[PDB]
Coordinates of N, CA and C in Angstrom, one line a residue:
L1 N 22.7 -60.3 3.9 CA 22.1 -60.7 5.2 C 20.7 -60.0 5.3
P2 N 19.8 -60.4 6.2 CA 18.5 -59.8 6.4 C 18.7 -58.4 7.0
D3 N 17.8 -57.5 6.8 CA 17.8 -56.1 7.3 C 17.4 -56.0 8.8
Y4 N 16.6 -57.0 9.2 CA 16.1 -57.1 10.6 C 16.1 -58.5 11.1
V5 N 16.7 -58.7 12.3 CA 16.7 -60.0 13.0 C 16.2 -59.8 14.4
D6 N 15.3 -60.6 14.9 CA 14.8 -60.6 16.2 C 14.4 -62.0 16.7
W7 N 15.4 -62.7 17.4 CA 15.2 -64.0 17.8 C 14.0 -64.3 18.8
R8 N 13.6 -63.2 19.4 CA 12.4 -63.2 20.3 C 11.1 -63.5 19.5
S9 N 11.0 -62.9 18.3 CA 9.8 -63.0 17.5 C 9.6 -64.5 16.9
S10 N 10.6 -65.3 17.0 CA 10.4 -66.7 16.6 C 10.6 -67.7 17.8
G11 N 10.5 -67.2 19.0 CA 10.5 -68.0 20.2 C 11.8 -68.7 20.6
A12 N 12.9 -68.0 20.3 CA 14.3 -68.5 20.6 C 14.9 -67.8 21.8
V13 N 14.1 -67.1 22.5 CA 14.5 -66.3 23.7 C 13.6 -66.5 24.9
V14 N 14.2 -67.0 26.0 CA 13.6 -67.1 27.3 C 13.3 -65.7 27.9
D15 N 12.2 -65.6 28.7 CA 11.9 -64.4 29.3 C 13.1 -63.8 30.2
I16 N 13.2 -62.5 30.2 CA 14.3 -61.8 30.9 C 14.5 -62.3 32.3
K17 N 15.8 -62.5 32.7 CA 16.2 -62.9 34.0 C 17.0 -61.8 34.8
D18 N 17.2 -62.0 36.0 CA 18.0 -61.1 36.9 C 19.1 -61.8 37.6
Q19 N 20.3 -61.4 37.3 CA 21.5 -62.0 38.0 C 21.6 -61.6 39.5
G20 N 20.9 -60.6 39.9 CA 20.9 -60.1 41.3 C 22.3 -59.6 41.7
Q21 N 22.6 -59.7 43.0 CA 23.8 -59.3 43.6 C 25.0 -60.3 43.4
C22 N 25.3 -60.6 42.2 CA 26.2 -61.6 41.8 C 26.8 -61.3 40.4
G23 N 28.1 -61.2 40.3 CA 28.7 -61.0 39.0 C 28.8 -62.3 38.2
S24 N 27.6 -62.8 37.9 CA 27.5 -64.1 37.2 C 27.1 -63.9 35.8
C25 N 27.2 -62.6 35.3 CA 26.7 -62.1 33.9 C 27.2 -63.1 32.8
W26 N 28.4 -63.5 33.0 CA 29.1 -64.5 32.0 C 28.2 -65.7 31.8
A27 N 27.6 -66.2 32.9 CA 26.8 -67.4 32.9 C 25.4 -67.1 32.3
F28 N 24.8 -66.0 32.5 CA 23.5 -65.6 31.9 C 23.7 -65.4 30.3
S29 N 24.8 -64.9 29.9 CA 25.2 -64.8 28.5 C 25.3 -66.1 27.8
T30 N 26.2 -67.0 28.4 CA 26.4 -68.4 28.0 C 25.0 -69.1 27.8
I31 N 24.2 -69.1 28.8 CA 22.9 -69.7 28.9 C 21.9 -69.2 27.8
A32 N 21.8 -67.9 27.7 CA 20.9 -67.3 26.7 C 21.3 -67.7 25.3
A33 N 22.6 -67.7 25.0 CA 23.1 -68.2 23.7 C 22.8 -69.7 23.5
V34 N 23.0 -70.5 24.5 CA 22.7 -72.0 24.5 C 21.2 -72.2 24.3
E35 N 20.4 -71.6 25.1 CA 18.9 -71.6 24.9 C 18.5 -71.3 23.5
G36 N 19.1 -70.3 22.9 CA 18.8 -69.8 21.5 C 19.1 -70.9 20.5
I37 N 20.3 -71.4 20.5 CA 20.7 -72.4 19.5 C 19.9 -73.7 19.6
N38 N 19.6 -74.1 20.8 CA 18.7 -75.3 21.1 C 17.4 -75.1 20.4
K39 N 16.7 -74.0 20.6 CA 15.5 -73.7 19.9 C 15.7 -73.8 18.4
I40 N 16.7 -73.1 17.9 CA 17.0 -73.1 16.5 C 17.2 -74.5 15.9
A41 N 18.0 -75.3 16.5 CA 18.3 -76.6 16.0 C 17.3 -77.7 16.3
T42 N 16.6 -77.6 17.5 CA 15.7 -78.7 17.9 C 14.2 -78.3 17.8
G43 N 13.9 -77.0 17.8 CA 12.5 -76.5 17.8 C 11.9 -76.3 19.2
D44 N 12.6 -76.7 20.2 CA 12.1 -76.5 21.6 C 12.8 -75.4 22.3
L45 N 12.1 -74.5 23.0 CA 12.7 -73.5 23.9 C 12.6 -74.0 25.4
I46 N 13.8 -74.2 25.9 CA 14.0 -74.7 27.3 C 14.9 -73.6 28.1
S47 N 14.4 -73.2 29.2 CA 15.2 -72.3 30.1 C 16.2 -73.1 30.9
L48 N 17.5 -72.7 30.8 CA 18.6 -73.5 31.3 C 19.3 -72.9 32.5
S49 N 20.2 -73.7 33.2 CA 20.6 -73.4 34.5 C 21.9 -72.5 34.6
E50 N 21.8 -71.3 35.0 CA 22.9 -70.4 35.3 C 23.7 -70.9 36.5
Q51 N 22.9 -71.3 37.5 CA 23.5 -71.7 38.8 C 24.5 -72.8 38.6
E52 N 24.2 -73.8 37.7 CA 25.1 -74.9 37.3 C 26.4 -74.4 36.8
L53 N 26.5 -73.3 36.0 CA 27.7 -72.7 35.6 C 28.5 -72.1 36.7
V54 N 27.7 -71.3 37.6 CA 28.3 -70.7 38.7 C 29.0 -71.7 39.6
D55 N 28.3 -72.7 40.0 CA 28.7 -73.8 41.0 C 29.7 -74.8 40.4
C56 N 29.5 -75.2 39.1 CA 30.2 -76.3 38.6 C 31.2 -76.0 37.4
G57 N 31.2 -74.8 37.0 CA 32.0 -74.3 35.9 C 33.2 -73.4 36.3
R58 N 33.6 -73.5 37.5 CA 34.8 -72.7 38.0 C 36.0 -73.1 37.2
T59 N 36.8 -72.1 36.8 CA 38.1 -72.3 36.2 C 39.1 -71.3 36.9
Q60 N 40.3 -71.3 36.4 CA 41.3 -70.4 36.8 C 40.8 -68.9 36.6
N61 N 40.1 -68.8 35.5 CA 39.6 -67.4 35.0 C 38.2 -67.1 35.4
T62 N 37.4 -68.2 35.5 CA 35.9 -68.1 35.7 C 35.6 -68.4 37.2
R63 N 35.0 -67.5 37.9 CA 34.9 -67.6 39.4 C 33.5 -67.2 39.9
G64 N 32.4 -67.9 39.4 CA 31.1 -67.7 39.9 C 30.6 -66.3 39.9
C65 N 30.4 -65.7 41.1 CA 29.9 -64.3 41.3 C 31.0 -63.3 41.1
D66 N 32.2 -63.7 41.0 CA 33.4 -62.8 40.8 C 33.8 -62.7 39.3
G67 N 32.9 -62.8 38.4 CA 33.1 -62.7 37.0 C 33.6 -64.0 36.3
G68 N 33.7 -64.0 35.0 CA 34.0 -65.1 34.2 C 33.9 -64.9 32.7
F69 N 33.9 -66.0 32.0 CA 34.0 -66.0 30.5 C 33.1 -67.0 29.9
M70 N 32.3 -66.5 28.9 CA 31.3 -67.3 28.2 C 32.0 -68.5 27.5
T71 N 33.2 -68.4 27.1 CA 34.0 -69.5 26.5 C 34.1 -70.6 27.5
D72 N 34.4 -70.3 28.8 CA 34.4 -71.3 29.9 C 33.0 -71.9 30.1
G73 N 32.0 -71.1 29.9 CA 30.6 -71.6 30.0 C 30.3 -72.6 29.0
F74 N 30.7 -72.4 27.7 CA 30.4 -73.3 26.6 C 31.2 -74.6 26.8
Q75 N 32.5 -74.4 27.2 CA 33.4 -75.5 27.5 C 32.9 -76.5 28.5
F76 N 32.3 -75.9 29.6 CA 31.8 -76.8 30.7 C 30.6 -77.6 30.1
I77 N 29.8 -77.0 29.4 CA 28.6 -77.7 28.8 C 29.1 -78.8 27.8
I78 N 30.1 -78.5 27.0 CA 30.6 -79.5 26.1 C 31.2 -80.6 26.9
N79 N 32.2 -80.3 27.8 CA 32.9 -81.3 28.6 C 31.9 -82.1 29.5
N80 N 30.9 -81.5 30.0 CA 29.9 -82.1 30.8 C 28.9 -83.0 30.0
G81 N 28.8 -82.8 28.7 CA 27.9 -83.5 27.9 C 26.5 -82.9 28.0
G82 N 26.4 -81.7 28.5 CA 25.1 -81.0 28.6 C 24.9 -80.1 29.8
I83 N 23.7 -79.5 29.9 CA 23.4 -78.6 31.0 C 21.9 -78.9 31.5
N84 N 21.7 -78.8 32.8 CA 20.4 -79.0 33.4 C 19.5 -77.8 33.1
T85 N 18.2 -77.9 33.5 CA 17.2 -76.8 33.3 C 17.3 -75.8 34.5
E86 N 16.7 -74.6 34.2 CA 16.5 -73.6 35.2 C 15.7 -74.1 36.4
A87 N 14.6 -74.8 36.0 CA 13.7 -75.4 37.0 C 14.3 -76.4 37.9
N88 N 15.2 -77.3 37.3 CA 15.8 -78.3 38.1 C 17.0 -77.9 38.9
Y89 N 17.7 -76.8 38.5 CA 18.9 -76.3 39.2 C 18.7 -74.8 39.2
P90 N 17.8 -74.3 40.1 CA 17.4 -72.9 40.1 C 18.5 -71.9 40.6
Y91 N 18.4 -70.7 40.2 CA 19.3 -69.6 40.5 C 19.2 -69.0 41.9
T92 N 20.3 -68.9 42.6 CA 20.3 -68.4 44.0 C 21.0 -67.1 44.2
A93 N 21.8 -66.7 43.1 CA 22.7 -65.5 43.2 C 23.8 -65.6 44.2
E94 N 24.1 -66.8 44.7 CA 25.3 -67.0 45.5 C 26.0 -68.2 45.0
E95 N 27.3 -68.3 45.2 CA 28.2 -69.4 44.8 C 27.9 -70.5 45.8
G96 N 27.5 -71.7 45.3 CA 27.2 -72.8 46.1 C 28.0 -74.0 45.7
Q97 N 27.9 -75.1 46.4 CA 28.6 -76.3 46.1 C 28.0 -77.0 44.8
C98 N 28.8 -77.5 44.0 CA 28.4 -78.1 42.8 C 27.5 -79.4 43.1
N99 N 26.3 -79.3 42.7 CA 25.4 -80.4 42.9 C 25.5 -81.5 41.9
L100 N 26.3 -82.5 42.2 CA 26.7 -83.5 41.3 C 25.6 -84.3 40.6
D101 N 24.5 -84.6 41.4 CA 23.3 -85.2 40.8 C 22.6 -84.3 39.8
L102 N 22.5 -83.0 40.1 CA 21.9 -82.1 39.1 C 22.8 -81.8 37.9
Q103 N 24.1 -81.8 38.1 CA 25.1 -81.7 37.1 C 25.0 -82.9 36.1
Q104 N 24.5 -84.1 36.6 CA 24.4 -85.3 35.8 C 23.1 -85.4 35.0
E105 N 22.2 -84.5 35.3 CA 20.9 -84.3 34.5 C 21.2 -83.4 33.3
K106 N 21.2 -83.9 32.1 CA 21.5 -83.2 30.9 C 20.3 -83.1 30.0
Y107 N 19.7 -81.9 29.9 CA 18.6 -81.7 29.0 C 18.9 -81.1 27.7
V108 N 19.9 -80.2 27.7 CA 20.4 -79.6 26.5 C 21.9 -79.8 26.3
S109 N 22.4 -80.0 25.1 CA 23.8 -80.1 24.8 C 24.2 -79.3 23.6
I110 N 25.5 -79.0 23.5 CA 26.1 -78.4 22.4 C 27.3 -79.2 21.9
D111 N 27.7 -79.0 20.6 CA 28.8 -79.8 20.1 C 30.1 -79.1 20.2
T112 N 30.1 -77.8 20.1 CA 31.3 -77.0 20.0 C 30.9 -75.5 20.3
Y113 N 31.9 -74.6 20.1 CA 31.6 -73.2 20.1 C 32.6 -72.5 19.3
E114 N 32.2 -71.2 18.8 CA 33.1 -70.5 18.0 C 33.2 -69.0 18.5
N115 N 34.4 -68.4 18.2 CA 34.6 -67.0 18.5 C 34.4 -66.3 17.2
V116 N 33.7 -65.1 17.3 CA 33.6 -64.2 16.1 C 34.9 -63.4 16.0
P117 N 35.5 -63.4 14.8 CA 36.7 -62.5 14.6 C 36.5 -61.2 15.3
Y118 N 37.5 -60.8 16.1 CA 37.5 -59.6 16.9 C 37.3 -58.4 16.1
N119 N 36.6 -57.4 16.7 CA 36.5 -56.0 16.1 C 36.0 -56.1 14.6
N120 N 34.9 -56.8 14.4 CA 34.4 -57.0 13.1 C 32.9 -57.1 13.2
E121 N 32.2 -56.0 13.1 CA 30.7 -55.9 13.3 C 30.0 -56.7 12.1
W122 N 30.7 -56.7 11.0 CA 30.1 -57.4 9.8 C 30.1 -58.9 10.1
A123 N 31.2 -59.5 10.7 CA 31.2 -60.9 11.1 C 30.3 -61.1 12.3
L124 N 30.1 -60.1 13.2 CA 29.1 -60.2 14.2 C 27.7 -60.3 13.7
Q125 N 27.4 -59.4 12.7 CA 26.1 -59.4 12.1 C 25.8 -60.7 11.4
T126 N 26.8 -61.3 10.7 CA 26.7 -62.6 10.1 C 26.3 -63.7 11.1
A127 N 27.0 -63.7 12.2 CA 26.7 -64.7 13.3 C 25.3 -64.5 13.9
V128 N 24.9 -63.2 14.1 CA 23.6 -62.9 14.7 C 22.4 -63.2 13.8
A129 N 22.7 -63.1 12.5 CA 21.7 -63.4 11.5 C 21.3 -64.9 11.6
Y130 N 22.2 -65.7 12.2 CA 22.0 -67.1 12.3 C 21.5 -67.6 13.7
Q131 N 21.9 -66.8 14.8 CA 21.5 -67.2 16.2 C 21.9 -66.1 17.1
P132 N 21.3 -66.1 18.4 CA 21.9 -65.3 19.4 C 23.4 -65.4 19.7
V133 N 24.0 -64.3 20.0 CA 25.5 -64.3 20.2 C 25.9 -63.7 21.5
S134 N 26.7 -64.4 22.3 CA 27.3 -63.9 23.6 C 28.3 -62.9 23.3
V135 N 28.2 -61.8 24.0 CA 29.1 -60.7 23.9 C 29.4 -60.1 25.2
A136 N 30.5 -59.3 25.3 CA 30.8 -58.6 26.5 C 31.0 -57.1 26.1
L137 N 30.6 -56.2 27.0 CA 30.7 -54.8 26.7 C 30.9 -54.0 28.0
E138 N 31.2 -52.7 27.9 CA 31.4 -51.7 29.0 C 30.1 -51.2 29.5
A139 N 29.7 -51.7 30.7 CA 28.4 -51.4 31.2 C 28.3 -50.7 32.5
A140 N 29.5 -50.2 33.0 CA 29.7 -49.6 34.3 C 29.3 -48.1 34.3
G141 N 29.2 -47.5 33.2 CA 28.9 -46.0 33.1 C 27.5 -45.6 33.5
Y142 N 27.4 -44.4 34.1 CA 26.1 -43.9 34.5 C 25.0 -44.1 33.4
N143 N 25.3 -43.7 32.2 CA 24.4 -43.7 31.1 C 23.9 -45.0 30.7
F144 N 24.8 -46.0 30.6 CA 24.4 -47.4 30.3 C 23.5 -47.9 31.4
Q145 N 23.9 -47.7 32.6 CA 23.2 -48.1 33.8 C 21.8 -47.5 33.9
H146 N 21.6 -46.2 33.5 CA 20.3 -45.6 33.5 C 19.5 -45.5 32.2
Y147 N 20.0 -46.2 31.2 CA 19.3 -46.4 30.0 C 17.9 -47.0 30.2
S148 N 16.9 -46.4 29.6 CA 15.5 -46.8 29.7 C 14.8 -46.9 28.4
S149 N 15.2 -46.1 27.4 CA 14.6 -46.2 26.1 C 15.4 -45.6 25.0
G150 N 15.2 -46.1 23.7 CA 15.9 -45.5 22.6 C 17.0 -46.4 22.1
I151 N 17.9 -45.8 21.3 CA 19.1 -46.5 20.8 C 20.2 -45.9 21.6
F152 N 20.9 -46.7 22.3 CA 22.1 -46.2 23.1 C 23.3 -46.0 22.2
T153 N 23.8 -44.7 22.3 CA 24.9 -44.3 21.5 C 26.1 -43.9 22.3
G154 N 26.1 -44.2 23.6 CA 27.1 -43.8 24.6 C 26.7 -42.6 25.3
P155 N 27.6 -42.0 26.1 CA 29.0 -42.4 26.2 C 29.3 -43.7 26.9
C156 N 30.3 -44.4 26.5 CA 30.7 -45.6 27.2 C 32.2 -45.9 26.9
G157 N 32.9 -46.5 27.8 CA 34.3 -47.0 27.5 C 34.2 -48.2 26.6
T158 N 35.3 -48.9 26.5 CA 35.4 -50.1 25.6 C 36.0 -51.4 26.3
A159 N 36.2 -51.3 27.6 CA 36.6 -52.4 28.4 C 35.4 -53.4 28.6
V160 N 35.6 -54.6 28.3 CA 34.5 -55.6 28.3 C 34.2 -56.1 29.7
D161 N 33.6 -55.3 30.5 CA 33.4 -55.6 32.0 C 32.1 -56.3 32.3
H162 N 31.2 -56.5 31.3 CA 29.9 -57.1 31.5 C 29.4 -57.8 30.3
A163 N 29.0 -59.1 30.5 CA 28.4 -59.9 29.4 C 26.9 -59.8 29.2
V164 N 26.5 -59.7 28.0 CA 25.1 -59.7 27.6 C 24.9 -60.7 26.4
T165 N 23.7 -60.7 25.8 CA 23.5 -61.6 24.6 C 22.8 -60.8 23.5
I166 N 23.4 -60.8 22.3 CA 22.7 -60.2 21.2 C 21.6 -61.2 20.7
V167 N 20.4 -60.6 20.6 CA 19.3 -61.4 20.2 C 18.7 -60.9 18.9
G168 N 19.3 -59.9 18.3 CA 18.9 -59.3 17.0 C 19.5 -58.0 16.6
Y169 N 19.0 -57.5 15.6 CA 19.5 -56.2 15.0 C 18.4 -55.6 14.1
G170 N 18.6 -54.3 13.9 CA 17.7 -53.6 12.9 C 18.1 -52.1 12.7
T171 N 17.2 -51.4 12.0 CA 17.4 -50.0 11.7 C 16.2 -49.2 12.1
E172 N 16.3 -48.0 12.7 CA 15.3 -47.1 13.0 C 15.8 -45.7 12.9
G173 N 15.0 -44.9 12.1 CA 15.4 -43.5 11.8 C 16.7 -43.3 11.2
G174 N 17.1 -44.3 10.4 CA 18.5 -44.4 9.7 C 19.6 -44.8 10.7
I175 N 19.2 -45.1 11.9 CA 20.2 -45.6 12.9 C 20.2 -47.1 13.1
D176 N 21.3 -47.8 12.8 CA 21.5 -49.2 13.0 C 21.6 -49.5 14.5
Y177 N 21.1 -50.6 14.9 CA 21.2 -51.1 16.3 C 21.3 -52.6 16.4
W178 N 21.9 -53.0 17.6 CA 21.9 -54.4 18.0 C 20.8 -54.5 19.1
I179 N 20.1 -55.6 19.2 CA 19.2 -55.9 20.3 C 19.9 -56.8 21.3
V180 N 20.0 -56.3 22.5 CA 20.8 -56.9 23.5 C 19.9 -57.3 24.7
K181 N 20.0 -58.6 25.0 CA 19.3 -59.1 26.2 C 20.3 -59.0 27.4
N182 N 19.9 -58.2 28.4 CA 20.7 -58.1 29.6 C 20.1 -58.9 30.7
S183 N 20.8 -59.1 31.8 CA 20.4 -59.9 32.9 C 20.3 -59.0 34.2
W184 N 19.7 -57.8 34.0 CA 19.4 -57.0 35.2 C 17.9 -56.9 35.4
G185 N 17.2 -57.9 35.0 CA 15.7 -58.0 35.2 C 15.0 -57.0 34.3
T186 N 13.6 -57.0 34.4 CA 12.8 -56.3 33.4 C 12.6 -54.8 33.7
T187 N 13.2 -54.3 34.8 CA 13.0 -52.9 35.2 C 14.1 -52.0 34.6
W188 N 15.2 -52.7 34.1 CA 16.2 -52.0 33.4 C 15.9 -51.9 31.9
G189 N 16.2 -50.8 31.3 CA 16.1 -50.6 29.8 C 14.7 -50.8 29.3
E190 N 14.7 -51.4 28.1 CA 13.4 -51.6 27.4 C 12.9 -53.0 27.8
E191 N 12.3 -53.0 29.0 CA 11.9 -54.3 29.7 C 13.0 -55.3 29.7
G192 N 14.2 -54.9 30.0 CA 15.3 -55.8 30.1 C 16.3 -55.8 29.0
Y193 N 15.8 -55.3 27.8 CA 16.6 -55.3 26.6 C 17.1 -53.9 26.3
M194 N 18.1 -53.8 25.5 CA 18.7 -52.5 25.0 C 18.9 -52.6 23.5
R195 N 18.5 -51.5 22.8 CA 19.0 -51.2 21.5 C 20.2 -50.4 21.6
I196 N 21.3 -50.9 21.0 CA 22.6 -50.2 21.1 C 23.2 -50.0 19.7
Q197 N 23.8 -48.9 19.5 CA 24.2 -48.5 18.1 C 25.2 -49.5 17.5
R198 N 24.9 -49.7 16.2 CA 25.6 -50.7 15.3 C 26.2 -50.0 14.1
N199 N 27.2 -50.7 13.6 CA 28.0 -50.2 12.4 C 28.7 -48.9 12.7
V200 N 29.4 -48.8 13.9 CA 30.2 -47.7 14.3 C 31.7 -48.0 14.0
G201 N 32.0 -49.3 13.8 CA 33.4 -49.7 13.4 C 34.2 -50.1 14.6
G202 N 35.4 -50.6 14.3 CA 36.4 -51.0 15.3 C 35.8 -52.0 16.3
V203 N 36.0 -51.7 17.6 CA 35.5 -52.6 18.7 C 34.0 -52.6 18.9
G204 N 33.3 -51.9 18.1 CA 31.8 -51.8 18.3 C 31.4 -50.9 19.4
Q205 N 30.2 -50.5 19.5 CA 29.7 -49.6 20.6 C 29.9 -50.3 22.0
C206 N 30.6 -49.6 22.8 CA 30.9 -50.0 24.2 C 31.8 -51.3 24.2
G207 N 32.5 -51.5 23.1 CA 33.4 -52.7 22.9 C 32.6 -54.0 22.6
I208 N 31.4 -53.9 22.1 CA 30.5 -55.1 21.9 C 31.0 -56.2 21.0
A209 N 31.9 -55.7 20.0 CA 32.5 -56.6 19.0 C 33.8 -57.2 19.4
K210 N 34.3 -57.0 20.6 CA 35.6 -57.4 21.1 C 35.7 -58.9 21.4
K211 N 34.7 -59.4 22.1 CA 34.8 -60.7 22.6 C 33.5 -61.5 22.4
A212 N 33.1 -61.7 21.2 CA 31.8 -62.3 20.8 C 32.1 -63.8 20.5
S213 N 31.2 -64.7 21.0 CA 31.2 -66.1 20.7 C 29.8 -66.7 20.8
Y214 N 29.6 -67.9 20.3 CA 28.3 -68.5 20.2 C 28.5 -70.0 20.2
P215 N 27.5 -70.8 20.7 CA 27.7 -72.2 20.8 C 27.2 -72.9 19.5
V216 N 27.7 -74.1 19.2 CA 27.4 -74.7 17.9 C 26.7 -76.1 18.2
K217 N 25.7 -76.4 17.3 CA 25.0 -77.7 17.3 C 25.1 -78.1 15.8
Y218 N 25.6 -79.3 15.6 CA 25.9 -79.7 14.2 C 24.6 -80.0 13.3
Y219 N 23.5 -80.3 14.0 CA 22.4 -80.8 13.2 C 21.1 -80.0 13.4
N220 N 20.3 -79.8 12.3 CA 19.1 -79.0 12.4 C 17.9 -79.8 12.0

């Protein structure tokens, strides 16, 4: 595999967003992954609708601002036959009624989605070498929350309480890292991103390798 991957450098990453006062992180992670594979397969970067997932992708497990699962995000897009744009169905950071007309406007679609084999950074690296990957990690700790620069090495737990998107990886000073796109806006971390330690084994740093998945498009 390549020694360095950065999906931002090839225009497969939309500018950093902010989920605000809403636990919709699962939706931002879904969308950032979908945005990435669309660019990769079609050559066009389109910013897509998190609100649509919040409002229209409710399941038994996925509940708008009260948390959810990227797998439910991908399923909704598959089942719906696509997703509308950010501009057409803008983000409000509150759970609203599903706008059926906007739900019927489909600008980007995916064919399927896949789970990365759990607790396998090598398999995660393989997936990331090909596209951005949706992951969940433990982001509630003081240090994760106040991260502003460098490579994050903890401390953190391993409960997957917050979804983000891996948009790359590399090495600096002999330390391997993942590049993580967060949805806490540009004032957190390295203008919204975090470099977090890679190749630590097991569940990955802050449990990053526990619940990884990515959307699939058959044709390039």
